[PDB]
Design an enzyme around this catalytic site. Structure first.
Site, PDB file in Angstrom:
ATOM      1  N   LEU A 121      10.220   2.557   7.455  1.00 52.57           N
ATOM      2  CA  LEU A 121      11.171   3.707   7.313  1.00 52.57           C
ATOM      3  C   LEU A 121      10.213   4.460   7.463  1.00 52.57           C
ATOM      4  O   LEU A 121      10.797   5.696   8.063  1.00 52.57           O
ATOM      5  CB  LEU A 121      11.838   3.748   6.307  1.00 52.57           C
ATOM      6  CG  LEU A 121      13.169   2.693   6.147  1.00 52.57           C
ATOM      7  CD1 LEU A 121      13.309   0.752   7.205  1.00 52.57           C
ATOM      8  CD2 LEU A 121      13.712   1.860   4.394  1.00 52.57           C
ATOM      9  N   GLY A 122       9.418   4.682   6.976  1.00 54.71           N
ATOM     10  CA  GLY A 122       7.862   5.794   7.484  1.00 54.71           C
ATOM     11  C   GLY A 122       7.100   6.401   6.628  1.00 54.71           C
ATOM     12  O   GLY A 122       6.820   5.495   5.140  1.00 54.71           O
ATOM     13  N   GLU A 123       6.322   6.722   6.827  1.00 51.69           N
ATOM     14  CA  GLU A 123       5.128   7.292   5.954  1.00 51.69           C
ATOM     15  C   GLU A 123       4.923   8.749   6.053  1.00 51.69           C
ATOM     16  O   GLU A 123       4.047   9.476   6.766  1.00 51.69           O
ATOM     17  CB  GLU A 123       3.415   6.532   6.432  1.00 51.69           C
ATOM     18  N   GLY A 124       5.403   9.510   4.925  1.00 54.52           N
ATOM     19  CA  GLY A 124       4.616  11.067   4.956  1.00 54.52           C
ATOM     20  C   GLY A 124       3.298  11.364   4.998  1.00 54.52           C
ATOM     21  O   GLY A 124       3.331  11.886   6.155  1.00 54.52           O
ATOM     22  N   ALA A 125       2.534  10.971   4.334  1.00 54.42           N
ATOM     23  CA  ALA A 125       1.123  10.700   3.655  1.00 54.42           C
ATOM     24  C   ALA A 125       0.403   9.936   2.863  1.00 54.42           C
ATOM     25  O   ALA A 125      -0.218   9.000   3.572  1.00 54.42           O
ATOM     26  CB  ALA A 125       0.878  12.316   3.447  1.00 54.42           C
ATOM     27  N   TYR A 126       0.990   9.512   1.505  1.00 47.75           N
ATOM     28  CA  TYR A 126       0.921   9.222   0.969  1.00 47.75           C
ATOM     29  C   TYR A 126       0.739   7.517   0.620  1.00 47.75           C
ATOM     30  O   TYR A 126       0.062   7.147   0.668  1.00 47.75           O
ATOM     31  CB  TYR A 126       1.646   9.322  -0.541  1.00 47.75           C
ATOM     32  N   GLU A 135       3.419   3.653   3.006  1.00 47.75           N
ATOM     33  CA  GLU A 135       4.860   3.468   3.690  1.00 47.75           C
ATOM     34  C   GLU A 135       5.874   2.861   3.260  1.00 47.75           C
ATOM     35  O   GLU A 135       5.288   2.738   2.149  1.00 47.75           O
ATOM     36  CB  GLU A 135       3.701   2.320   4.769  1.00 47.75           C
ATOM     37  N   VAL A 136       6.366   3.308   3.525  1.00 49.73           N
ATOM     38  CA  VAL A 136       8.158   2.676   3.372  1.00 49.73           C
ATOM     39  C   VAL A 136       8.981   1.844   4.015  1.00 49.73           C
ATOM     40  O   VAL A 136       8.443   1.749   4.979  1.00 49.73           O
ATOM     41  CB  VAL A 136       8.979   4.146   2.808  1.00 49.73           C
ATOM     42  CG1 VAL A 136      10.996   3.248   2.415  1.00 49.73           C
ATOM     43  CG2 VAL A 136       8.669   4.746   2.116  1.00 49.73           C
ATOM     44  N   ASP A 146       8.464  20.140  -1.855  1.00 48.31           N
ATOM     45  CA  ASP A 146       8.430  19.366  -0.267  1.00 48.31           C
ATOM     46  C   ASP A 146      10.207  19.240   0.451  1.00 48.31           C
ATOM     47  O   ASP A 146       9.903  18.662   0.822  1.00 48.31           O
ATOM     48  CB  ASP A 146       7.825  18.440   0.305  1.00 48.31           C
ATOM     49  CG  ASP A 146       7.359  18.866   2.073  1.00 48.31           C
ATOM     50  OD1 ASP A 146       7.532  20.100   2.239  1.00 48.31           O
ATOM     51  OD2 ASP A 146       6.467  17.794   2.016  1.00 48.31           O
TER      52      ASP A 146
HETATM   53  N1  LIG Z   1      15.030   6.088   0.183  1.00 47.30           N
HETATM   54  C1  LIG Z   1      14.799   6.028   1.649  1.00 47.30           C
HETATM   55  N2  LIG Z   1      15.866   5.032   1.912  1.00 47.30           N
HETATM   56  C2  LIG Z   1      15.984   4.678   4.084  1.00 47.30           C
HETATM   57  N3  LIG Z   1      15.130   5.903   4.768  1.00 47.30           N
HETATM   58  C3  LIG Z   1      13.209   6.254   3.863  1.00 47.30           C
HETATM   59  N4  LIG Z   1      12.719   6.562   3.657  1.00 47.30           N
HETATM   60  C4  LIG Z   1      11.587   6.290   3.479  1.00 47.30           C
HETATM   61  N5  LIG Z   1      12.733   6.754   1.967  1.00 47.30           N
HETATM   62  C5  LIG Z   1      13.762   6.022   2.476  1.00 47.30           C
END
Ligand SMILES: Nc1ncnc2[nH]cnc12
Length: 259
Positions: free
Chosen positions: A9-14, A16-17, A118
């Site tokens: 779902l993505g990685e801000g910095a800290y 990976e989700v 943020d």
């Molecule tokens: N809780 C979340 N639901 C959906 N996409 C995300 N990306 C990061 N955290 C998320």
């Protein structure tokens, strides 16, 4: 509760989700993942305090080794980043709605002594009934505790969303830094453009804002009702800058638009 990790779902910095779906019940969740070798205890701790319909619901955590797993609510709707068409934004009735929920969300944190630090469209996710959630408490911090307010001095954020005080002062109040980033989310949503690299005096696009040259982009793509609100938000002096109680009074904020 043996979940399969599916899409990233993505990685801000800290960290990976992942989306994680539950094998047996099929409950969809988001697992944040952080390798404590290749600030983060504080994100867990802050997430333990939180409980609002505009904050991403924390479910729990298990260490299980070098990794740290955060179990967070799932926003099937994804980031508000993607509802913003580049250079045009989104319809004014939806812009407002998300700002009502951002404002809701932020009142709540600010009322429990917590600042996000943020606020930006990539950290505002939408769920199934298109409700905005405040996510990622990696850079969050307590500013009020035992009803004593503490000043932050540590610089962090995303330059285009950050308040000037944070570039130009040595310590600053936490609430105004989040009202600013809320104002810049409103700019993004209504014009589909960030107005400046960062709110420095060295920057043309900001110098023009303080000079009320509202005839330029991205300000000319915004109606005079929400534009009036913004004038009140991106004030350079955080004591002059409107508060959330008073944004709740603003004409645009209470203008009927959304069915
Ligand atoms: N809780 C979340 N639901 C959906 N996409 C995300 N990306 C990061 N955290 C998320």
């Amino acid at each position: 509760e043996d979940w399969d990790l599916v899409q990233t779902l993505g990685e801000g910095a800290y960290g990976e989700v992942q989306l994680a779906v539950n094998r047996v019940t099929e409950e969809a969740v988001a697992v944040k993942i952080v390798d404590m070798k290749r600030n983060i205890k504080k994100e867990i701790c802050i997430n333990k305090m939180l409980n609002h319909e505009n904050v991403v619901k924390f479910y729990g955590h298990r260490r299980e080794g070098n990794i740290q797993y955060l179990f967070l609510e799932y926003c099937s709707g994804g980031e508000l980043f993607d509802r913003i068409e580049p250079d045009i934004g989104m319809p004014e009735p939806d812009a407002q709605r998300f700002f009502h929920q951002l404002m809701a969300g932020v009142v709540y944190l600010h009322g429990i002594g917590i600042t996000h630090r943020d606020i930006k469209p990539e950290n505002l996710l939408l769920d199934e009934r298109d409700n905005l959630k405040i996510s990622d408490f990696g850079l969050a911090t307590v500013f009020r505790y035992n009803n004593r307010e503490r000043l932050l001095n540590k610089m962090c954020g995303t330059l285009p969303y950050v308040a000037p005080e944070l570039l130009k002062r040595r310590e600053f109040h936490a609430e105004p830094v989040d009202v600013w980033s809320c104002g810049i989310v409103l700019t993004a949503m209504l014009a589909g453009e960030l107005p400046w690299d960062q709110p420095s005096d060295s920057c043309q696009e900001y110098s023009d804002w303080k000079e009320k040259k509202t005839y330029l982009n991205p300000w000319k793509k915004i109606d005079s009702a929400p534009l009036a609100l913004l004038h009140k938000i991106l004030v350079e002096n955080p004591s002059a800058r409107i508060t959330i109680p008073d944004i709740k009074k603003d004409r645009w904020y209470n203008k009927p638009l959304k069915k």
